[PDB]
Write a protein that binds this ligand. Structure first.
Ligand SMILES: O=C1NC(=O)N([C@H]2C[C@H](O)[C@@H](COP(=O)(O)O)O2)C[C@H]1[N+](=O)[O-]
Ligand SMILES: O=C1NC(=O)N([C@H]2C[C@H](O)[C@@H](COP(=O)(O)O)O2)C[C@H]1[N+](=O)[O-]
Lengths: 264, 264
């Protein structure tokens, strides 16, 4: 996508050399924002093939409040394996905070239901927020949430969403994060009887791994194809009742996949 | 300031009419980002006079973890009066969350010290964050934090900071929020022996009150003057040992003040 390739070029042109915790260098910029009109099409990167199957399953898993990879395994989704312990536990990561944020007084807050209530009963609210950044539980998480904080917004029958992503691997992480939040906006809009508006992506440390220079050059040579169209085949009675087969992507014609290897 | 006046014009040109909880209309946009190179000067709005005295005292009060207005009163700062109860209590707002975020296991997390540790011992960290968005304590706050979440970043001996502000009154609130965070970046840089980099402001619902049309037109007619220079007169031994008189602003020559009235 146009916005994505401009970010990619901007990191190459403007990134400063920064070490990360792996020891691999990165090229890094701090602070960037992009916007996707969801009425223009589903924002799935076309300049390299992205397997949507994993994105969907992960999102459904988040919404269940599940932090054990067992569900992902039933479906042969392995994207969380490197972080899981022998039991398949990740600690209180994303889904746990979305659905069951623990308070000092013994409650567990369902942030997803809260947001649905607000969208339905107080759509002009400037407080419609989900946070995964639970300071008291960070130590226990396999890793700190990258996509940390998001806000919904309703104007003119349109649902928009802004994500604050503290840390972003532009090559491996970003394509997947944008699709995942766009899908969530579509499910939220469906459940609230609203139209989709904008997805606004905001980045903190937004970086390319230094061993991804060739892959980045390769991708930047490719021309974006038209965006696909997301189809939702049914309206469940709840945001928690979606199933994998409810979603269809139409018109997706990507350039071939690019493998990007990682250091250990 | 240039960036500020462009935001102001952009809300007028692009804002949609949105009601708020007061009942006053707003003109609102969702998602905006601006950047201030702090080496170019202190970002205090010149196209209307801003009284820095209040900004400073409020910031020192935040850093104390104090949520009772008593300290502000000793100094005849009244900006929090409309929200305080008869005892002068605000509930567990900003300062309480910065200095003493309560965990379910009975701890209180000092996020300011945490950030200082990281800046000194692990400056490449992509997790150097302070959040005021404590989901379990929102109900008890006089109001939900507007400036909710911020991230620090170190590259090339320069300290940058990004603020996510969920809700922003462009006329009354914003000038004051930018100065307050720029001052914090200067104090943090001083304590960590770093140079100042960028302050990146990111907005959610960014709005002008509909009864501020005349004041906005007036201000937009004015030409920005050069930015002032911040002077810190001493280096305290701790981020908690700053005093009002440690700060001086040099070269500040603003156009006259503009009063903006509010509905009740
Ligand atoms: O969804 C995600 N998107 C991402 O881009 N990441 C990336 C950003 C970083 O390159 C890395 C996390 O490392 P730290 O930022 O050091 O925690 O993983 C994180 C990630 N995740 O852990 O789920
Ligand atoms: O620092 C601040 N900056 C701001 O711009 N505000 C503004 C944004 C809104 O116009 C209003 C808060 O109302 P809600 O967004 O409805 O909570 O107050 C909030 C504020 N504060 O409460 O400290």
């Amino acid at each position: 996508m146009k916005q994505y390739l401009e970010l990619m070029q901007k990191v190459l042109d403007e990134g400063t050399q920064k070490n990360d915790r792996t020891g691999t260098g990165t090229l890094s910029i701090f602070g960037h924002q992009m916007r996707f009109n969801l009425q223009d099409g589903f924002p799935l990167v076309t300049t390299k093939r992205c397997h949507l199957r994993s994105i969907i399953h992960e999102l459904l898993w988040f919404l269940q409040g599940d932090t054990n990879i067992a569900y992902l395994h039933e479906n042969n989704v392995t994207i969380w394996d490197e972080w899981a312990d022998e039991n398949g536990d990740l600690g209180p990561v994303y889904g746990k905070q979305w659905r069951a944020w623990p308070t000092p007084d013994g409650r567990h807050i369902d942030q997803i239901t809260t947001v649905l209530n607000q969208l339905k009963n107080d759509p002009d609210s400037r407080r419609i927020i989900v946070s995964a950044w639970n300071v008291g539980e960070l130590d226990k998480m396999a890793l700190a949430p990258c996509h940390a904080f998001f806000q919904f917004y309703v104007a003119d029958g349109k649902l928009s969403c802004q994500l604050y992503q503290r840390s972003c691997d532009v090559f491996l992480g970003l394509p997947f994060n944008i699709a995942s939040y766009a899908l969530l906006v579509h499910m939220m809009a469906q459940q609230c009887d609203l139209e989709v508006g904008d997805f606004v992506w905001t980045g903190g440390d937004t970086h390319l791994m230094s061993n991804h220079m060739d892959q980045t050059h390769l991708q930047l040579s490719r021309e974006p194809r038209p965006l696909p169209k997301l189809i939702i085949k049914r309206k469940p009675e709840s945001i928690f009742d979606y199933r994998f087969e409810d979603f269809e992507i139409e018109g997706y014609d990507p350039h071939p996949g690019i493998k990007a290897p990682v250091a250990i």
